[PDB]
Amino acid sequence: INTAQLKSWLESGESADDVFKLLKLDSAADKVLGHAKLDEWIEYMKLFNGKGSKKTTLIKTLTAHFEDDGVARMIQKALQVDSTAKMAKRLQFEQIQRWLGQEKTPEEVLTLLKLDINRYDLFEKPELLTWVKYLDDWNKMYPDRQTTLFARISPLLEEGILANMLIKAKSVASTEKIALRIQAEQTASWLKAEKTPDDLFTLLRLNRAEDSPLLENPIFDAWVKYADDFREMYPKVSFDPIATISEHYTAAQVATMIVEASKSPSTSSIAHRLNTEQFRDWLNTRQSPVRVFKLLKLDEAGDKLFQSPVITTWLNYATFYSTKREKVSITTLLRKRFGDEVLAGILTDAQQVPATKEEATKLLTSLVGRWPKSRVHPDNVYKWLRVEGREKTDGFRLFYERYAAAY
């Protein structure tokens, strides 16, 4: 404690603010908290505070030199340093008390913290954390004047833009809680406006596809959950979402988005759900395997049907149909459509493509197995399976051999 100096200052009539500036403490906000010069100043502020003098606090003086948003940022970082952490926590309290003591509404403090200017960077601003803590203290302090995060933020940000921001705010540790929490209020706000899942779909731009495989969008998984949460409360006047989706995308379009998203853990969960929805809708409305075939336009692929992205969708639905409603042979269908020679060729091709290798084989084993009874000559068994081009060990070649010998 430089008594000499403190005395010198008192006897010049330096205010506590004059000394804050003699100390050049307003130079850099990041060299203030937990530094020796502020400790000098604090000792002078005690002495200054008297008795005909104009009292000041440390909060009042910091705010007067760095502004509310400036002070909020100063605390926020100082909370992340151990040296200064206890100081920062007390100083944070005193900031919030000052505002509550005035009665700066959460809306007024939002402006003081310049969060309205910084709207679109909201969740990146340290001052946001100060403000959330102030709103929450405000609501406890004045229960007759309550307000919510979403009520103070949504007038600043377009509904869809706010959604995108929350979704990214969630992948961040410091703002994830807050982002969930505003998400919750935003959902309830939509629910009580009633707001149908189909209105919401287009409110959130989900009917576009320029930049999206859509199932990659957490907005899309956000929707759907709103829709689950819209059966919800209004069980009577509701649909489920495959209805909504289908207003903007076709069967074959939808089936591909699904075939895609199911190849990564990130989206395999929304994909197998949407897949459930599509299968359920086909079966509810009594789509046979044959009927779904056309809905996916696999008849317009001709002989190239095993090269369609949705061929596995169709084979799956057919396996699904037979287990649930009535056994339908895919083999029988493909056989009547192409014939033994063209189908054997088709499937032999599909064996070489890895994503169809196993269902190609499984169908071809089924095809070939009906051939003994259909009186197929071993030359035809040979040429149609393209045995000549197969490996010495290939199961279909060894089938050919035993079929030739038995015959």
Added chain:
Amino acid sequence: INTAQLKSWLESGESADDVFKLLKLDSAADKVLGHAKLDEWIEYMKLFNGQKGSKKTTLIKTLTAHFEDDGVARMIQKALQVDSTAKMAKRLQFEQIQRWLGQEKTPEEVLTLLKLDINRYDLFEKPELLTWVKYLDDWNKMYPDRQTTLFARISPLLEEGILANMLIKAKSVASTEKIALRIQAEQTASWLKAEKTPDDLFTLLRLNRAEDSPLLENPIFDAWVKYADDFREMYPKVSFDPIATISEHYTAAQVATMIVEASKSPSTSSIAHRLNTEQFRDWLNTRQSPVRVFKLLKLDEAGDKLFQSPVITTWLNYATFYSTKREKVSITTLLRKRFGDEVLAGILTDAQQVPATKEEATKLLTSLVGRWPKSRVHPDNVYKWLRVEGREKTDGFRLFYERYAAAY
């Protein structure tokens, strides 16, 4: 200190003033308060005054006759800073002020007395100013019915802008900071109370008429933005957007360039980022597409030199900002339709060699070339257009070329 001398002067019949002259204390004002012979003069002054029926005098009154009110004020204020002379300076200051207060000279009349009105435009450089500030405060104390402020007495000498400017430089001088801050507060305060709109304060401070000074340089500009903030926060009902004001005097491009040329200096770094946030906000909120902003920034008029405009980084940042908050928009797709694979490949490759553009040029060139296989760009065009020849053996674009020539 020299009795024979004093005796002699008293015998010679000398006045106090004569002896002031004899000691050559009127020689230079700055020698006096320190001077050896002044204490000599003071003893004589007592002795002279002690004589029956002599016309009395005083130290303040003798200094004033010889150096004028402003010269004595300048003496007292220099001597207030030396340890050796400080306590006499303090006491002289007091008798000066007492004497003025006695004659009931208003702060205004003391202003003219100290020739501060003449020296108006050099105001803060005159030590006499400090003397006058003190006088106004002690006057306020002495005649509480008749108070003024510093701002109220200086304001009529000067245009509002000119005062604002000298206040800034005065703020950065140690002897005038306390005073300059005082007057700033009184200036700001007076504008608020007159509900002077941020838009009207813009022209008054002449921030519109800037051609020879870009704007974010200006400490008055920062001051204006703080005024506009205090104004919103005191009249929340009166809807004010900073960008709206600046852009009736400037173009989107002009404004983005000031921001680019301000971000580099760390001292304007803060006002730069502010104004950038504003600009983006207004674009996003008025739903300006990345292509529309392209036209706004006048990057279409730079043709194939767009990546040499100060403002290209502004556009790309905006483009990325826009894609994150609203709707993803491919910057490659935009530029490829504009230029062609060849012209664009050359634009990017140049931009790849400039520090400020290389990281984005590279991401953009990476996106562009990824599309070349489905467009069947001939491998010799890939090698030419990418300037693969200038590229290091390790370079990813050279490696692209190698893998691509083998598969075609």
